[PDB]
Amino acid sequence: PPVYKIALGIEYDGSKYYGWQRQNEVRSVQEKLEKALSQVANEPITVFCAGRTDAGVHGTGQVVHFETTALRKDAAWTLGVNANLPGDIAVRWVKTVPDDFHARFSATARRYRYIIYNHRLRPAVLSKGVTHFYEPLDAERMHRAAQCLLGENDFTSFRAVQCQSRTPWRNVMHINVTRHGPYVVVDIKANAFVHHMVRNIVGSLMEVGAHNQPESWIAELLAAKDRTLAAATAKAEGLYLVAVDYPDRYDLPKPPMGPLFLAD
Amino acid sequence: PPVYKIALGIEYDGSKYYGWQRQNEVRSVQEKLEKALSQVANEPITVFCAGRTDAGVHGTGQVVHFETTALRKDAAWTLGVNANLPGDIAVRWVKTVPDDFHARFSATARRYRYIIYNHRLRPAVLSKGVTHFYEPLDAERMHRAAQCLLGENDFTSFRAVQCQSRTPWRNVMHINVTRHGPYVVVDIKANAFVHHMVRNIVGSLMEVGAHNQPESWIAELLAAKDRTLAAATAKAEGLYLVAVDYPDRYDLPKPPMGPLFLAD
RNA sequence: CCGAGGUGGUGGAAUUGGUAGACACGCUACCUUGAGGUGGUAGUGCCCAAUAGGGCUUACGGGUUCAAGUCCCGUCCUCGG
RNA sequence: CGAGGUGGUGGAAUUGGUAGACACGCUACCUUGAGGUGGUAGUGCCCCUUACGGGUUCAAGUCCCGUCCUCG
Structure with a gap:
């Protein structure tokens, strides 16, 4: 058979x-x-x-x-x-x-996107599809600040208490922070991830765009190798696993990632 | 008091x-x-x-x-x-x-947007927020075809059957058909609307982009002044009342319309 | 003595009246499983007889208001030199 | 130069996808404009179901067999 x-x-x-x-x-x-x-x-x-x-x-x-x-x-x-x-x-x-x-x-690598709704008032449409964030955000600061996580690093400070892998090391391919309308999108990618890494990166990454922390703060936390220092993990209520990578030999169909309208 | x-x-x-x-x-x-x-x-x-x-x-x-x-x-x-x-x-x-x-x-005028998902397979995200459509659509034909409904017209053919008075006439300001990713958006506006006016336009308008009808067909139906001759109605499951108009004197706040990411 | 401060078992929050304890750790029993941790579910407070659906809880009783840990009046406190 | 049998009607269902969409009628329960129109809910079994039995498949309005029909 x-x-x-x-x-x-x-x-x-x-x-x-x-x-x-x-x-x-x-x-x-x-x-x-x-x-x-x-x-x-x-x-x-x-x-x-x-x-x-x-x-x-x-x-x-x-x-x-x-x-x-x-x-x-x-x-x-x-x-x-x-x-x-x-x-x-x-x-x-x-x-x-x-x-x-x-x-x-x-x-070979996985990629996520996070959708933040940056408005003082709650959103209806896609209510459970996006994270709410009253405090005004700064897409530029966030992006900037979030540019030191690029490359092989020890995301300890950004890794969840418990996990499963052995090492707190990962290689981040790209991490760009943009803003479409009152929406702020976080796009990130890396060979693999550590428990809650993304819901943490953003978590803190949110603080920077809110001027509740400086820009360097990010790289500071990272280098600090300590979870208890960075903003609390963010509501999964907006984390979208937008795409994964595989060897060209296997050849797998590549459609849009969005989600929704968001372009690739 | x-x-x-x-x-x-x-x-x-x-x-x-x-x-x-x-x-x-x-x-x-x-x-x-x-x-x-x-x-x-x-x-x-x-x-x-x-x-x-x-x-x-x-x-x-x-x-x-x-x-x-x-x-x-x-x-x-x-x-x-x-x-x-x-x-x-x-x-x-x-x-x-x-x-x-x-x-x-x-x-003074109301505006709607219709989101059509044009993919042979059902969608998950925003499942109840967009209309699923298998057969392939042509944003250009649709747009083209849908360019004769512009201006004061007798949308009888496009009005929901029951009626006797308060005219089948309406003045359509603009009606553009676009496509973002596998998504097809219908944006329309007019002083006011007739029962189902939109859910029908599209309804038929869908046929044209599917080559199940020619392009002229639209203007034909319209001029035909007869409901039963135009493709059935369109699923309400994607009709978004995106915006209404009022005199500048009243002065009302104008935020985004989207929905979601869709730009104004 | 005038001023700081009192939020679960902890650490630690709350759009600056909006409508609690977000994030996390630590334990009780439970589930998967085989008991490899991880992962999930209920608690970890108080009542309404149990049932149940819920209700009261932010040191403690009062007040203000449509709504109060968050404004106000005091009661017990916990300190700063 | 033609071929069929889905609810009260018309009249649709991806490639065999998982049912009656859409529109007329019909009865409810509401319902402002102010010239009076609209909303929603109901409209095949009984305390499974697309003429009715079959066969094939994970899958059957949708292909094959039959049976009684409708028809040129």
Whole structure:
């Protein structure tokens, strides 16, 4: 019985979910994704994440791969599966791949985007899709300040109390801070990440644009190698896993990342 | 006991509501808005809309005015209010006004935007915020075709069947069709609108960009003065009342319309 | 003696009246698991008989107001030289 | 030179995707303009369902078989 390994571009809205990692007592994208992915392959399927996102953490460039004997047409994995998927979780594409591929271990780099709503008043539309921030922000200071995190560094100061990896070291590829309308977007990328790194970078990074801290403060915290010094972690309520990287050899479809209108 | 008349910029998400219209035994923005607007002024408040929005029709430039004796600072109408408001419905600003003002009648022109998702696969993020469309669209044909509805016309063909009087005539200011990413936005404006006017224009307008109809077809339907001949209506599931107009004399705050990131 | 200050078990917050304890650590039991930590769920306060849905809680009783840890009046305090 | 049988009607459903969208009628419960129009909710079983039985698939208004029809 020949087996098949295919990849899927999962895009979801953790608005109403407790993270990706399946549970027992609560809702988890995975659980669902599998629940339906299997209902297709007609054989208990189990999928592999590529970035075990947190709880209430939206995703649009999430990638997963699962093995299966079931030989579907192609529209199946697509419409087929989405067909049994709750409106908040859907597929974007599918592409068979070689055993050498592994949505989590074949990844070369992952990328996130954070959407901050910078207005004194709460927002309605996409309420659970963006983070609220009254205090005025400065996209320039933030960007500037946040330019020392570039390169291989010891994000200890920015890593969550507990974790899993061994080292607090990571290589940040790019980290640009922009502003579209009253919205401030944080775009970042790095080989891999440490627990809550992004929800922390921003966290503090927010302080700088609010002049509640100087610009150097960032590099200061970093060099300080100490978590308890930097602003509190930010509300996952706006972290979007916009894109992951894989070797060109595997060749995976690259659609938009947004989210929504935001250009690539 | 002196009375006060103030205006509010209500922004909501009809995702989970039965439309703007106040109802009994159901959820309606109004009901809520009042429910809370009053809690503050501490005297059964009743508001006046400026554009009765159908069911599941988002709004961001919605304007309403209500009278009240209650002399609240201005933190109430802006914050105090929202505080008693469900995440999907919030205020954006408030500005006292003269009796001569009336959110619905003082209006000189109203404007909407329609967001179409043009991808063969369903979308997750903002699931109830955008209309899903499989077959490929042509932003150019659509735009082109949709250029004869400009000016005073007899939108009979485009008006929701029931009617007898108060004319099928309307003056369309501008109607441009664009495309941002796999998203297709329809932006339109006119002195006022006829029942479903927009949800129909698009409706058909969708057909043209799908080459399921020629370009002239639009002007044909229009001139044909007949509902049954134009493609069915369009899902309210993406109609956003982005903005309304009022005389400069009243002077009302003009923030962004979007929705979301979409620029003005 | 005039002035500082009193928020859970801790560290540590609260758009400058808006409507609590954000972020984190530490423990009680629970879940996955096999008990590798990690990850989730409830507590870690007080009542309403339990049930239940909820309600009261920011040193303690009063007041102001549509709304108060946040303004005001005092009660017990905890200090600064 | 033509071919069919989805609710009270018309009349649509991606590539076999997971049902009646849209519009008319019909009954409710509301409902300001101020010339009186509008909102929402209901409109196939009973305490599963697209003439009705089959077959194939993870998947069936949608392909194959049948049965009774509608038709040129």
